Amino acid sequence: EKRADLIEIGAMERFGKLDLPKVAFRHDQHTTAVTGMGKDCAACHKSKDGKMSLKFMRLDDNSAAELKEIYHANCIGCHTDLAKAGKKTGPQDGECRSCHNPKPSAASSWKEIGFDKSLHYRHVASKAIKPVGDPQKNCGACHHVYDEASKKLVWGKNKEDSCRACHGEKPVDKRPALDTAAHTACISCHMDVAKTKAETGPVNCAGCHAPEAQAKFKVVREVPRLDRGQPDAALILPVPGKDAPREMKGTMKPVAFDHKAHEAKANDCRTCHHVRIDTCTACHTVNGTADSKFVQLEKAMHQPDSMRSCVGCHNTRVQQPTCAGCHGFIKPTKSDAQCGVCHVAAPGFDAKQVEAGALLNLKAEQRSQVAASMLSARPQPKGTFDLNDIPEKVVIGSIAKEYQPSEFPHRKIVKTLIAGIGEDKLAATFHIEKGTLCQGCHHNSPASLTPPKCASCHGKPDRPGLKAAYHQQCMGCHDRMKIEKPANTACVDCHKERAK
Ligand code: HEC
Ligand code: HEC
Ligand code: HEC
Ligand code: HEC
Ligand code: HEC
Ligand code: HEC
Ligand code: HEC
Ligand code: HEC
Ligand code: HEC
Ligand code: HEC
Ligand code: HEC
Ligand code: HEC
Ligand code: HEC
Ligand code: HEC
């Protein structure tokens, strides 16, 4: 009952109220049958100048009357001819309700489809897609901008973007809507390559929009960089923008951004460039603009719950079990030091000149030099204290009573925690002190080789008592890290039975 190929035909509703229900149409069911009878798309779609219309048996919608005749004459005509041939067929001319069906045809499994970097690269890498306007580059086969001089579309070198950047839910001006744009360009090419029997893309509705079909697409794990002329190192500045006089100026040190490293770890460009490839400050000025619906630069970069912001995406990262043990327990400090991981001094510039705009009109190559400098000048990772310098096992028995004191495997766990982190660079860079990792459990005191006892703040005598403090911390981390043994229900694996 789940289908991804449903079309609810309701085109004449634009001309006025419909007398009868819209007509449900299974496109994949129809192309399969048409193929089997030796026909193709041309059975139902006309073309004009080598471009196939996506409309049924027409190039324009001229009137309600004309449209009704096109549907009835052509839809029913085929059904009738198949009937007298004694073949499987659809509703006959007199079965009004069988097409004009008030009850839904099937359920919809339809899913949107898009290019992650793997799929985009599988297209870039295809021999079947030939270079355009270049000895090697493939880009012009798919990407365009409108050239006002020639009054036509041309490949705009290094101005390639997702189709969504210029094609919307509805056709604005002579830019078609996204669905028309994609259905036209994508499927047309797929059908051409299919003729050469070189590997190609889907033509069936289900082939693109069915979750089952999507799961089957070959994925490439190591995907080459998609180079469109973007910086390796970006310099993000508190851009005020022309509007709002006086306008807000920045108050922090500037931020250098390793754009190249982030590409390698992200799954596309759009994740961050959510409207179009450009700066962020084009819309998210310090004060915000109408074009950002007044979302300010600060929000764009710090929004804790958005995948688009520095802090937000990093926040999803720390929800990994290897991180979540500590990160589901600790509270951010918002200390100057932590802010300083991103906001750093620029070489040769003072604070007064940066939030004066001294950097705003520098050439891309020059700001890259400045940014790369800021990136390389960041101190080397201090790592963690030598684990041999902390107790290997601590006895937790301050409140022993019903059980024996816990013999806590202190050093072994810390070692596992560092192992679990591995070469994660987000962990390496933001864990700025030798004892930062220690604070994942020893919270609310400075990073140190010698943190105070929990009892110094808990249940001695807001805050939990000492037993609650232990249980919540121990059991909590194990749940978040998916630690199987010990089980939280195993009441003796952390503190052995009284006597017995
Ligand atoms: C499937 C093969 C059809 C059969 C059998 C009948 N109709 Fe139909 N009709 C069909 C389509 C694809 C459309 C367009 C639907 C839309 O809303 O765009 C139509 C259109 C009409 C209309 C005009 C639109 C409306 O007012 O709802 C009418 C009045 C109409 N159809 C009538 C009608 C009757 C009475 C039929 C039995 C004699 C009949 N239809 C059969 C598809 C099919
Ligand atoms: C007649 C039985 C059809 C055959 C064979 C093919 N298509 Fe079709 N298509 C048909 C209809 C009735 C419609 C709805 C438009 C209308 O004027 O009522 C369509 C629509 C499409 C679409 C758009 C889908 C959507 O956006 O909802 C596409 C992209 C499309 N069709 C492609 C297509 C191709 C490539 C075909 C051969 C493989 C083909 N169609 C055959 C009817 C029929
Ligand atoms: C031959 C070129 C056809 C044209 C043009 C249209 N249809 Fe059709 N239809 C055709 C066949 C051979 C079948 C049966 C397919 C099968 O495998 O059973 C059908 C069936 C339908 C149905 C019934 C769907 C179902 O519930 O099983 C409907 C409602 C239907 N057809 C609608 C329809 C409309 C509205 C068309 C114009 C847009 C149309 N069809 C054209 C063959 C052909
Ligand atoms: C803005 C930079 C655009 C991006 C990114 C994409 N498209 Fe586009 N497209 C754009 C304009 C200004 C127009 C209208 C041209 C005119 O004559 O005024 C278009 C048009 C199309 C069309 C229609 C013409 C045709 O090819 O038959 C298609 C099919 C189309 N666009 C597809 C398309 C796809 C698939 C894109 C992502 C790969 C894409 N466009 C991006 C502007 C822009
Ligand atoms: C030529 C100019 C194409 C355009 C435009 C689009 N696609 Fe494509 N596609 C093309 C080829 C040559 C191939 C084969 C690549 C290979 O592996 O050799 C493909 C393949 C796909 C696939 C993968 C199918 C599978 O793995 O089974 C999909 C899902 C796909 N294509 C989708 C797609 C979409 C949605 C497009 C516009 C947004 C699009 N393609 C354009 C060639 C061309
Ligand atoms: C992969 C090459 C496609 C094939 C084959 C078909 N569709 Fe498609 N469709 C495709 C894209 C890339 C898009 C744009 C949005 C997206 O999914 O990325 C669409 C869009 C639609 C829509 C419009 C959804 C909306 O937001 O209004 C529908 C309902 C739709 N597509 C239907 C459809 C049908 C019925 C097809 C067979 C005729 C079909 N599509 C094929 C990509 C591809
Ligand atoms: C990297 C993950 C960030 C951390 C950690 C913090 N900030 Fe940030 N901030 C970041 C970016 C990418 C930007 C835009 C570039 C710029 O420097 O303007 C910002 C911007 C601000 C702003 C607005 C601009 C300004 O007033 O100068 C403020 C007020 C700001 N940042 C404050 C701030 C503080 C107090 C932080 C620690 C709690 C902090 N930031 C962390 C990136 C990152
Ligand atoms: C047609 C088969 C393509 C070729 C060849 C190239 N691109 Fe592409 N690109 C294509 C599509 C359909 C899309 C949008 C996919 C979506 O789901 O939105 C794109 C997108 C881009 C982007 C934006 C990345 C993103 O986050 O979506 C860029 C920067 C881009 N394309 C660049 C690019 C370049 C430089 C290419 C030649 C090396 C190139 N593209 C080829 C389809 C196709
Ligand atoms: C978030 C992790 C990003 C990913 C993934 C990609 N980009 Fe990016 N980009 C990002 C930021 C924060 C910035 C700085 C913008 C600012 O306001 O300073 C950028 C900048 C660019 C630029 C430079 C534009 C300019 O300075 O005029 C380009 C051209 C660019 N980005 C392109 C791009 C492409 C094509 C990507 C996929 C291959 C891509 N970016 C990913 C953040 C992120
Ligand atoms: C104008 C074309 C914009 C550019 C360039 C960037 N953004 Fe944006 N952004 C814009 C709008 C219209 C909105 C509000 C509507 C919306 O899409 O949410 C936003 C919003 C954000 C947000 C907030 C998300 C949330 O959940 O609250 C963030 C964090 C954000 N944008 C980030 C961001 C970044 C990092 C960009 C450069 C890569 C960027 N934006 C550019 C408009 C525009
Ligand atoms: C997911 C969409 C991310 C967004 C948006 C941003 N970051 Fe990021 N960050 C992310 C990962 C998965 C990584 C590891 C890959 C890497 O680039 O090393 C990181 C790491 C950092 C680091 C440490 C390493 C480095 O590249 O310098 C810093 C200092 C950093 N991130 C900064 C940063 C800023 C300032 C961003 C907003 C402009 C930002 N990140 C976005 C994932 C994602
Ligand atoms: C306990 C041993 C830790 C583990 C395991 C991980 N992190 Fe961590 N991290 C920890 C502390 C005590 C702090 C200091 C918080 C403060 O505000 O002073 C941090 C901080 C970070 C940050 C900075 C932003 C923040 O969330 O406060 C990041 C981005 C970060 N850590 C990332 C991170 C990742 C990706 C980890 C798993 C690979 C990870 N951390 C583990 C303690 C501990
Ligand atoms: C390790 C992950 C634990 C599990 C599982 C359980 N407990 Fe626990 N508990 C733990 C610690 C580190 C401590 C402190 C030890 C001390 O004596 O200081 C405790 C403490 C208690 C106490 C209070 C002390 C006492 O009366 O002996 C009780 C009564 C207690 N815990 C009960 C208990 C039960 C019934 C459990 C099974 C559900 C259980 N704990 C599991 C660590 C861990
Ligand atoms: C959670 C998994 C821990 C991490 C990460 C680190 N330590 Fe820890 N330590 C932890 C507990 C539950 C206790 C018991 C404290 C109590 O009050 O019962 C301890 C204790 C210490 C002590 C002894 C304190 C005292 O008894 O007065 C020291 C000196 C100590 N731990 C140091 C330490 C350091 C420096 C770490 C980072 C390398 C570190 N711990 C990590 C839990 C956890």
UniProtKB/Swiss-Prot annotation:
Binding sites annotated in the UniProt record for heme c 7: H183, C205, C208, H209
Stated name of the protein: High-molecular-weight cytochrome c
Keywords: Electron transport, Heme, Iron, Metal-binding, Periplasm, Repeat, Signal, Transport
Functional description taken from the UniProt entry: HMWC (high-molecular-weight cytochrome c), ORF2, ORF3, ORF4, ORF5 and ORF6 in the HMC operon form a transmembrane protein complex that allows electron flow from the periplasmic hydrogenase to the cytoplasmic enzymes that catalyze reduction of sulfates.
Binding positions (heme c 15): C474, C477, H478
Residues that bind heme c 4: H120, C139, C142, H143
Organism name: Nitratidesulfovibrio vulgaris (strain ATCC 29579 / DSM 644 / CCUG 34227 / NCIMB 8303 / VKM B-1760 / Hildenborough) (Desulfovibrio vulgaris)
InterPro entries found in the cross-reference section: Cyt_c_III, Cyt_c_III_dom, Cyt_cc3, HmcA, Multihaem_cyt_sf, Multiheme_Cytochr_ET
Classification via NCBIfam families: CxxCH_16_HmcA (NF045713)
Binding-site positions, heme c 2: H30, C75, C78, H79
Record: residues binding heme c 12: H302, C339, C342, H343
Residues binding heme c 9, per UniProt: H274, C280, C283, H284
Binding site for heme c 8: H259, C269, C272, H273
Residues annotated as binding heme c 13: H410, C438, C441, H442
Top-level lineage group: Bacteria
Amino acids binding heme c 1: H27, C41, C44, H45
Residue positions binding heme c 11: C323, C326, H327, H431
Binding site for heme c 5: H144, C163, C166, H167
Binding-site residues for heme c 14, renumbered to this chain: H443, C454, C457, H458
Record-listed heme c 3 binding positions: H72, C96, C99, H100
PTM (free text): Binds 16 heme c groups per subunit. High-spin heme 15 has single axial histidine ligand and the other hemes are low-spin bis-histidinyl coordinated.
GO cellular component terms, semicolon-separated: periplasmic space
Assembly description: Monomer.
